[PDB]
Amino acid sequence: PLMVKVLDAVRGSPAINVAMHVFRKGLTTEEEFVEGIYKVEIDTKSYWKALGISPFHEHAEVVFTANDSGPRRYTIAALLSPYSYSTTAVVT
Template identity: 45%
Template structure:
């Protein structure tokens, strides 16, 4: 009986150990994002976004990447490793089109998150939490 119990415990424990996701391309970028729909508690799939960089000097923005979120609310890295430079960047999330695709209207037609990269070697993650009438962002890890 104790042998069966030990085997059962060992099998249970080996099955419950979480494994790293098999998506290295999603995790290895120097700039990534993740969008969650807080109205449903689910990832925001199919949301269009773009990354631009502010040119120095002046106010000219240059588009660097355009993506759509996958079923998990994530997309391929916006800046692959080694491509980031120190400077000011803007992530624009097309929230009105996303909410319209779900049959809702949105108070915010888009969300722009402007941030500064001071250490290009550091991995940056910019999550966005959205609902039709609010949004929240923060510097993630």
């Protein structure tokens, strides 16, 4: 017998992130998995992936140039950070 208790009794307004998993029992292959439950991706790149079987097989002339530049700005407060009775501000 499996018994599980999380946050059984609560009073007074807390700020919570809850993630709970209970379990009982060809270029890319994946089976029976859990991914990215609380996940954040910012400015993520991917250029070539899984092009296939037999690409550029015979006499291929390829020029690959990847320029990553330019004025880019990212400003975040309280990323995956719950708070209570607090003050959060972004001022510019």
